[PDB]
Amino acid sequence: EYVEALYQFDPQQDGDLGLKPGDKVQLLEKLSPEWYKGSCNGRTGIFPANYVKPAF
Numbered sequence: 257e258y259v260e261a262l263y264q265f266d267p268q269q270d271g272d273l274g275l276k277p278g279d280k281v282q283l284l285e286k287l288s289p290e291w292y293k294g295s296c297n298g299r300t301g302i303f304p305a306n307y308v309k310p311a312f
Contacts, residue, residue, distance in 0.1 A: 257283040259294070259308040273301030280311050 259281050267274040273294060275281070281294040281303075292305050 258311040259283050259292075260311040261308050263307050265303050265307045267301070271301050273299055273303045275303055275307055281308065 261275040261277050261279040261281065263275075264277060265272075265275040273281070273296060275296070279296050281296040283292060283294050284300070285293040286305070287293055287302065288305075290305055291302050292308070293302050294300070
């Protein structure tokens, strides 16, 4: 499963996966309704679920 970032998430804590709009992210785990774990361009971390939409 892959998702696409719609909004810029600026990371603030170690383990956060920063996102720029258009970035496609491999979804590794849905931790809760509010936080996902994923990978993008070689980086792995967590990000809020409402920054992204389905891609494939």
